[PDB]
Design brief:
The structure is cut from a larger assembly and holds seven copies of chain A (276 residues). Chain A has helices at 25-34, 50-53, 62-66, 80-86, 118-123, 140-157, 170-183, 197-203, 218-230, 240-243, 248-261, 265-275; strands at 42-46, 75-78, 95-98, 100-101, 113-114, 128-133, 161-165, 187-191, 208-211, 235-237. With 276 residues, chain A is an alpha/beta fold. Chains A, B, C, D, E, F, G: It is an enzyme of class 2 (transferase).
Chain lengths: 276, 276, 276, 276, 276, 276, 276
């Protein structure tokens, strides 16, 4: 009375996430937490700037200002320090730990070191670890070494590594993104570019996520989102453009719309206003 | 132009999951994946029986039969072998890896050993590892040693351990659950008991999940669920009672209702029929 | 304008705790948490019996029954499982982790293995780790090996080891306590003996703590306490005799008095009744 | 005849210490040794200055001058060298080991390295390890790296890390404290600021303890204490302001009062005089 | 009824690959994948330039441009990043992983560090790992240290190391190739030289492979190939000269012919045109 | 004005201790602590019997009975437990730690395991570690494995191993001593034999020390000592025959005389009486 | 003025030793010490029997009896105990360390365990390590495991492993030798067989050395040697047949002759008598 369904042969489900087709199950799993499998994209709420900047504006009180924001994000990005202290475990959202540091705004910006062991990143159940790479800066060599070291460790343990390009035109980000990706980073985070972003994406063999940069009027930020996605980015991280907006949650739903659901910039903006 | 909100002092968000208030962030995180923070409960779809049983009925083809079932479960439980081969990473559901094995239905049932390294469990992004404890059986000592070893390893790494009690009355399950919990297991999985289940829960300091046992008519299984939850269980795993039902998905929604939403057995059953 | 007080030469303060004069600072420190430096004694509240016994009477609900008891104890003794789940860290009392297990009341009692890694004992900030030795029982060899192994590990890390003698006359406890001590245990926990206890203490080169055994009427337990201390024991652990008493806290103050303050059994009992 | 109290369901005791709600039992335990659970605060007697300063005034003879002081402190802070040699283990007080060093007052102050292994810290039963971070100084990068490394090690083992900010206004200590905390330090030690201290506390997600700085007249030091506490500090360390006072013990009870008991500066001072 | 063929004595098959006669079986095996045992030569398709160059011309899209090229190569050479993301495992071709990096075209070229652990190289089933040595450049010391370290690791594990000489006459390449070989590299990759290439090969005790350098008209590249082989090279890597040619596949068959089959430059070229 | 004394060539001082001529400096040093370089012999005061025997007669109180005895011994032999608790470090005598145990007089005698890690032996500054071998007993295999393991460890670290033969004629001790020595033990401890002791010594390639065995009248013990030495033993250990004598110190001087100074039994005995 | 001899191409010298053509340089080097490269054979003087036998006849005093014998042997075989104590390092002969033991002639012969770490073998500069395999005996499983373990370790380090077959006809030694070889042993040592030895050799893919067995009259031992060599053995070990002969040295020259130089048995014997 057992059925092996011999007439129907087992078939492998493809993993479509860009450039992550050859990864072990655990690694693909972590990535799948970050990038929605249906849409292949992610909305990331990153608040890690304290790491070299101290209490930046809008990050003065993560526990109050940002805590309400978590639910509307696909993935969180912060330091391990902040995570343990003021991010509730029950927040139940995937995190990308920031794992570079040891610079200040008072000194050379590119002077970064690995800021936590994979050991602890694994201890914290991270979906990925992130570090900054600084092509063209004084400590560009150490920066890449940082990525390298994170990838060596991540590979033993199934932890993806995200390389963030710290700094301004396409040719440049192409170099920076590509080198990072090539070194082994599974996720690249970078900036949007008004001319030639497509080349950047096309040249990168792994998913790209874009950082928001300085605060803009929402309408403009959304347009940037819309453009980035339209041009093949896999996620957007609006930092300042979110936690700094007077209507954060509204903004996020805007961003969710552009990213996952395809809304056009205008509609997006409108529900932006809708949700105030 | 910065606001530290000095008038409002940072306050710690309590972690209410039973007996899990003193765990590092990562461990609390993994547990939060398993047990819903809002309701403090879980619906678990366990298909690990192949481990000593081979192609048991209804588990003949996980890839076909059970694959459709994943989305309606809070947490999956299977072997690492099965997980890699036929569970799609994109399934994006938390897994509890079954980590004991080396027994057959052809020999002594309690003769189990640890069946994978924490190393690999971590590599596979598990939310927990599970092993069987066999109080009263011939290899009861090894079984506990197994739990012990998994907890020693999990604590290095933030991985919770689930001890499952393999075997029939309350006093008995009390002993078995309690010893396991006392050894260190963060989650206990065990069987429902018509008389005295409350004592079992009350005496266990950590979350309890119940296994379904042999297939029953749905109405009866739901009643069992309803009872277990009403009596303080933190989740239910209906194995056979689900994958074997002619209308699996419908059953799961039934179970979701009882567990998370509080529906009474009858209503539950009714949407059971509703969903066919 | 600096004073080195050359006329007054630095002198070493002796460490008087019995048999612990040649230990490193950290180990001496942990022992000092357990045994009061002024009186050289400890009142221990041990509730670890669940470890092979399940929900023994009075330990049904540690979180409710025993939780109120902590403050009146010098040192707590429990399993790591119970400690993490239901002992509040803020309890701020030194713990001795029970580190043997894998036996049941359903099987041979002496069949114990080491139940946690020093690694985790250290992670849990223990003052000491404890295991049972079973001279004359079937698994007496393993039991000693367990002590040995715990001492090998504790020495790397500054962790004292407590050997408990599980089982009935003096000559016997002498053999057992002495072997344990000799193997390397810093603390011996054992049973009181109506004839010859003095020889037991005298023959042990390290501190002895006595377990209470089965519940007695308080008057009788106190007398036993009084006798044990009078005869050179360094501490008492009244398990059942405390958590099972109808007036626990009162009992503890009774015990405190006998142990630290020297009250005679009768006075002790009287404030026993006083404190109800 | 057993009572599981089923009518009464086990509930988790919150851990209220600021930013320490997501830590494993052991680490929470160590912290609870330092910061009183009832008041959430600590009085710290730090005499570690020898580390780069040699026999500073008042620290000429720890063994004579400071030894009497121990009992009136919540936590001690010294080097491992001093601890072993002249702090009696029986002192029975929690210690925070100073773990940075390799600088002299004869050379660049910020040139510090890690000055002991976590291995030894654990061997010494520390409640935490401390190192200095030097934002703005020449070796600011190494200083952070030192914190990072101590956190990486401490997390393996349950050991909290204290970052002390070495150097003068709020905006500055905000940057320094926040980066350290963000890197992962569980305790921040810093200086009081007459304007804007609240922002410093508000911006730090973990407990802050303030250093006394140069000796002041007691009345003034108390006011500083009072102000620090009133403004949200979790502890105070009056170094010079204590061991250098002509009436040390009296001062401490003054500080105890302000810190734990809430006395107003004036009353505090008065029992200061009272206790001479 | 068994035949041991005693009349015929077992004889050892020689391993003829240059300078690889004293290697363990596994190492010999990996080399045998790379260099054809019959002809003792290899045709290598290297696309690792992204590593310090970003999306160089013709490497813009490995996945599209180069993917078709794989089947006609003996061995592939790329970074671990590119390999995982866009090289299909089923490509079933031996790879030599590029294992140096951390330089940019924006900074000193010779500033390279080891860019992956042997650990991961082994995890990726590599046939060899490669790094650049830079005699005469600013970071020539680190470069050799790099080779050293890879050989140290590769020897533990059976992994050959390729040293590539980055930079122009014979005497020079002799120095560079020889030092690398001498340090321990099993494969040397270097440039062709119009005068004195013979001395270069003759002085190297291990196989040499030549890099193509800047794109040339095919006829000329083939002549270079032909010459290199004729003068004792063991393989050629035409990078640009292949992926940049308008007729890549045709080129490779050209190169295959010269290398393995001995065709003269002219015939080679002709089938070059033939295969368009 | 420097003199290299070229006319006088550096010459190597031989190391004459039997069978120890090919040992590294550290190991030769430790052995030199035990066996006097001038006479090549040792007087050993062993009190380790508590290890399986409990408080044997005369070892009831090491701290009182045996403490006076240390100064008159070349080397001490006890457990690590006893050593830490009641042997003063300032005793300044070399120790041979007893490193086997886990047996009781209540069970099979030969059932021993390694009783402490070389790690701790080294931590205790031992001159050697000792374990028992039991040829012909039930656990003879494990006993030899014990010796093997200690040697494996000791060789990493410069620690000599002493194998004691536990049990009755020459042919027998020859087998036992020789196997142990052959396995790798640097020192053999064994019993004296009235016929054929010479063959035992002659067949052992490394130093032999003899155990006293049951208490005898001093005159007879001395004669045994005298005979053992006369027949080539390298040391004697009179356990019972010393600590049990009514005039211990006198006895030791007797033994010193026979062993190091060559006194004849009678003279020896006489100063025995002399020294009462 | 440099000559690279381009006209003459580097060629690989074959390594002809049987079944050792695919080993790393170091391993081939150690084997080359044992087996003469010219003749591909070895004369081994083995005196390791003390290991389970005690002072066997003729091994009573290695230092005297056997010491003279070393120079006339190609390779020595003894225990590590004996080697350190009584084999002079200056003996300058290759040794094969006996690495199994823990049996006695008083108990089951096949009960052997690994008797030293590869770590020490390497420390002693061994050419190989040897252990016994016991097909058909009670502990045959452990015996093979022993070989396995040694090979695992030896391969890390370049150390060949010799398996000796302990026990009587061809079919039998075929099984035994072949299994050992197959497991991974590089050298097999076994007994000569009057019928079918050829099959044994032919069936073994690696060098075979024969043990002499019980003492025979020289003429007969020589004939055995001659026959073994004639039938394809790669070396002989005459233990007893040498150290027990009245004219040892003469015997060895006899054996040398048969083995390396091809002398016929008779001539061999004659120079046997010649050399007395």
């Amino acid at each position: 009375g057992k059925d092996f369904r011999t007439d129907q042969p087992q078939k492998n489900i493809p993993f479509t996430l860009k450039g992550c087709g050859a990864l072990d199950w655990g690694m693909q799993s972590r990535l799948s937490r970050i990038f929605n499998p249906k849409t292949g994209k992610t909305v990331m709420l990153a608040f890690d700037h304290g790491y070299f900047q101290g209490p930046t504006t809008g990050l003065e009180r993560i526990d109050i200002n940002i805590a309400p924001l978590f639910e509307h994000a696909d993935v969180l990005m912060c330091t391990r320090g902040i995570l343990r202290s003021v991010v509730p475990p029950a927040t139940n959202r995937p995190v990308v730990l920031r794992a570079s540091g040891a610079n200040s705004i008072l000194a050379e910006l590119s002077n970064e070191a690995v800021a936590l062991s994979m050991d602890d990143a694994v201890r914290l159940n991270s979906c990925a670890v992130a570090a900054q790479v600084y092509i063209g800066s004084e400590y560009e060599h150490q920066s890449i070494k940082n990525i390298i070291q994170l990838v060596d460790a991540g590979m033993k343990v199934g932890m993806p590594t995200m390389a963030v390009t710290g700094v301004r035109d396409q040719r440049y980000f192409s170099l920076a993104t590509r080198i990072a990706a090539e070194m082994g980073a599974q996720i690249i985070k970078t900036y949007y570019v008004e001319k030639g972003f497509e080349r950047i994406v096309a040249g990168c063999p792994v998913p790209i996520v874009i950082a928001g940069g300085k605060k803009l009027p929402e309408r403009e930020a959304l347009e940037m989102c819309w453009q980035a996605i339209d041009q093949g980015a896999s996620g957007v991280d609006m930092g300042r453009n979110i936690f700094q907006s007077d209507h954060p949650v509204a903004m996020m739903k805007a961003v969710q719309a552009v990213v996952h659901h395809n809304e056009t910039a205008d509609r997006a903006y409108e529900l932006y206003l809708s949700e105030k």
